[PDB]
Amino acid sequence: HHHANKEATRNAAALFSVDYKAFLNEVSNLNKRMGDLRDINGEAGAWARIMSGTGSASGGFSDNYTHVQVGVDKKHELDGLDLFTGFTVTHTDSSASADVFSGKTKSVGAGLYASAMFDSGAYIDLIGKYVHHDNEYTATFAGLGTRDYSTHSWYAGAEAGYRYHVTEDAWIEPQAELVYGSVSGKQFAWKDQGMHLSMKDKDYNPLIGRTGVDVGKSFSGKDWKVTARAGLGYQFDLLANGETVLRDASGEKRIKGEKDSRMLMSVGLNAEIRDNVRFGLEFEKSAFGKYNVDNAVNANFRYSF
Numbered sequence: 001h002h003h004a005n006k007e008a009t010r011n012a013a014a015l016f017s018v019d020y021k022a023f024l025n026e027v028s029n030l031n032k033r034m035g036d037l038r039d040i041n042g043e044a045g046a047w048a049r050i051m052s053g054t055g056s057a058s059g060g061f062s063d064n065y066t067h068v069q070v071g072v073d074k075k076h077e078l079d080g081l082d083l084f085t086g087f088t089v090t091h092t093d094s095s096a097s098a099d100v101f102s103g104k105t106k107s108v109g110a111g112l113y114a115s116a117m118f119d120s121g122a123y124i125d126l127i128g129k130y131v132h133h134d135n136e137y138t139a140t141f142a143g144l145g146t147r148d149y150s151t152h153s154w155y156a157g158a159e160a161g162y163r164y165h166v167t168e169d170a171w172i173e174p175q176a177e178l179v180y181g182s183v184s185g186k187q188f189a190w191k192d193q194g195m196h197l198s199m200k201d202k203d204y205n206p207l208i209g210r211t212g213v214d215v216g217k218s219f220s221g222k223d224w225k226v227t228a229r230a231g232l233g234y235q236f237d238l239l240a241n242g243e244t245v246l247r248d249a250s251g252e253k254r255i256k257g258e259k260d261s262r263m264l265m266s267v268g269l270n271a272e273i274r275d276n277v278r279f280g281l282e283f284e285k286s287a288f289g290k291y292n293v294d295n296a297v298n299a300n301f302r303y304s305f
C-alpha cells in the first residue's frame with residue numbers, strides 16, 4: 001500500500017502542476033512586455049510581443065510554450081513623468097509531458113496596465129489581467145486516459161525599480177515585483193478495475209515575488225540607439241495554498257502545495273530606430289529550482305506616434 005501510494009502521489013502532483021506552469025508562463029515584467037518606455041515622444045502606442053520557451057523539472061517533466069501578446073495605449077505627459085495607460089490581449093499555446101502524461105494547454109487573456117516612467121529614473125508598472133485555459137492531458141497511470149478541462153486565472157502584479165546612471169552611458173537598476181493570482185481548481189472522477197477513484201484540487205492563490213538588478217551600457221547616433229543589458233534576479237513563491245486530494249476505496253489522501261524559487265539570468269538589448277520604432281530582445285534562463293526555464297527568448301516591438 002505505501003509504495004502504491006507514493007507513486008499515485010508523485011503522479012497526481014506532476015499532472016496537477018501543469019496548472020502551476022500555465023500560471024507562471026503569464027507572469028512577466030515591464031521590460032519584457034513593453035520594452036523600454038523611457039523618453040518616448042508619441043502620445044499613443046501599439047505594440048506586440050512574442051515569447052518562446054522551454055523548461056523542465058524532476059519526474060521527466062518538460063514543457064515549452066509560445067506566448068503572443070499585443071496592446072495599445074495612451075501616454076499622458078505630466079511633470080517629469082510619463083504615464084502609459086492601455087489594454088492588452090494574449091495567446092499561449094503550451095505543451096507538456098512527463099513519465100506518465102502528456103498534453104497541451106491553450107490560453108487566451110486580456111488586461112489593463114498603467115506604466116509610470118519618472119525623469120528621476122524611477123518606474124512603476126501595474127497590471128491586471130484575466131486568462132482562460134483550455135487543457136487536454138493524457139495519462140496512462142490509473143486508467144485515467146484522456147481529460148479535457150478548463151481553468152481560469154486572475155493576475156494582479158506590481159513592479160517598481162530605479163535606474164541609477166553611473167555614467168552618461170552606463171546604468172544599474174534594482175527591481176522588485178509582486179504578482180498575486182488565482183487559479184481555479186478541478187476534479188476528475190473515474191473508474192479503474194471496478195473501483196471508483198478520484199482526484200481533486202481546490203482553488204488556490206499564487207503570490208510570486210521577484211528581486212533583481214539589471215545593468216546596461218548604451219550607444220547612440222542622431223537617429224538611433226542601442227542598449228546592451230543583462231540582469232540577475234531571484235524569483236520565489238511566497239505561498240503554496242494549493243492542495244490535491246486523492247480518494248479511493250481504502251481512503252483519502254491530501255497533498256499540499258510546495259514553494260519553489262530559482263535564480264533568474266538574462267542578456268539582451270533594446271533598440272531605438274528614428275522616432276517611432278523600438279525593439280527589445282532578451283535571452284533568459286533560470287538556475288537552482290525544482291522547475292527551471294532551460295532557455296527562452298522574448299521579442300517585443302513598439303510603434304509610438
Ligand SMILES: CCCCCCCCOCCOCCOCCOCCO
Nearest residue numbers: 265266267283284285287288294295296
Ligand atoms: C551553477 C549554475 C549557475 C550558472 C548557470 C550557467 C551560466 C552559463 O550561461 C551564461 C548565462 O548568461 C546569462 C544569460 O542567459 C542567457 C540564456 O541563454 C543560455 C541558455 O543556456
Ligand SMILES: CCCCCCCCOCCOCCOCCOCCO
Nearest residue numbers: 219220226227228229267268269281283
Ligand atoms: C544580446 C546581444 C547583445 C548585443 C550587444 C550590443 C551591440 C550594439 O552595440 C552598438 C555599438 O555601437 C558602436 C560602438 O562600439 C562599441 C564597442 O562595443 C561593441 C561590442 O559589440
